[PDB]
Design a protein around this ligand. Structure first.
Ligand code: IJ9
Length: 330
């Protein structure tokens, strides 16, 4: 089997991408944030504390003929921004882009933190990291991909995120029309539960390439590109007036600037992030200070190839017995 679904930016900055997911019978369609950096499929629901729901579409398990309480199971998760959610668990039929998993754990939120409430466009998350990170207790649950894997034509999914435009998540096949050149595959470590790999270096703008190993994770659920402070400083040093602002929480730059590209290495191949992809616009409405799309990982303990990087590429998440990541230009 295969599936194919369109993913759409939630706003004009590409802060996140949402993909429609069918849950239950009859289908209840919720728009979920596919997150290769976590492993829980959780939704706003009829159980979510009413004051914490503000415009989201909710899953109502009592209206699904295929829903079953996963008795005694609970879940609780926090994300890198400090947001969190928790609740109980149903199993139900879940379909993405025509690909169906029966008995998928659907984690129903009883509580969500303020950043989730405030984002009316995100109805929940669909985790696509390794199932060893799933938070359901006492019986850990598998991701949608892990459950689908054995049925897929090939044990892969691909992320083809757009820049200020929709893109595609495919399951079970590689769309050879969706990229240019070849896909370069690179080894993955699953030891931390992430799609963790080692970039071979970077370049700023038209500069020469610096060969240096950069461990990090491919994370569709993170907006920005978080890299070591040395690399990030070398990038922003090329932008007049750019500086790290403790009050804003990262590098800002004059909105009057044109930004240089940023290249990262994948083996002997290179992915070039256009400068415009690094512009996240005014820090507040009307400001002439703009927020940078490349930020230091120093406070977080891990480098993160988030959407800024991934949307410059066609990315293969190969979940074969030895997992690998593939990157192609597009
Ligand atoms: C600090 C620190 C150390 N590490 C915990 C950093 C890491 N963080 C991760 C994620 O938590 C998983 N994917 C990202 C993600 N964030 C979301 C999200 C959050 C809020 C809202 Br509102 C909507 C979506 N979805 O995915 C970040 C992996 S490693």
């Amino acid at each position: 089997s295969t599936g194919s679904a369109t993913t759409t930016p939630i706003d004009s900055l590409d802060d996140a991408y949402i993909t429609p997911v069918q849950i239950g019978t009859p289908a209840q369609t919720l728009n979920l944030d596919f997150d290769t950096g976590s492993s829980d499929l959780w939704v706003f629901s009829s159980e979510t504390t009413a004051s914490e729901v503000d415009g989201q579409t909710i899953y109502t398990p009592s209206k699904s003929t295929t829903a079953k309480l996963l008795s005694g199971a609970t879940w609780s998760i926090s994300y890198g921004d400090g947001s969190s959610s928790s609740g109980d668990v149903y199993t139900d039929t879940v379909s993405v882009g025509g690909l169906t998993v029966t008995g998928q754990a659907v984690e129903s939120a009883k509580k969500v933190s303020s950043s989730f409430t405030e984002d009316s466009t995100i109805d929940g998350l669909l985790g696509l990291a390794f199932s060893t990170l799933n938070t359901v207790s006492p019986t850990q649950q598998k991701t949608f991909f892990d459950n689908a894997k054995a049925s897929l034509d090939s044990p892969v999914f691909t992320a083809d995120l757009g820049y200020h435009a929709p893109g595609t998540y495919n399951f079970g096949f590689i769309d050879t029309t969706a990229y240019t050149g070849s896909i370069t595959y690179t080894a993955v470590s699953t030891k931390q539960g992430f799609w963790e790999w080692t970039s071979t270096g970077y370049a700023v703008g038209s500069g020469t390439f610096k060969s240096t190993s950069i461990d990090g994770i491919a994370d569709t659920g993170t907006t920005l590109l978080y890299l070591p402070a040395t690399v990030v400083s070398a990038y922003w040093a090329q932008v007049s007036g750019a500086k790290s602002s403790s009050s804003v929480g990262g590098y800002v730059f004059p909105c009057s600037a044109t930004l240089p590209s940023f290249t990262f290495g994948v083996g002997s191949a290179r992915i070039v992030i256009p400068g415009d992809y690094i512009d996240f616009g005014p820090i507040s409405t009307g400001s002439s200070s703009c927020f940078g799309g490349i930020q230091s990982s120093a406070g977080i303990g891990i480098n993160i190839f988030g959407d800024v990087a991934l949307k410059a590429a066609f990315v293969v998440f190969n979940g074969a017995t030895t997992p690998t990541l593939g990157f192609a230009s597009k």
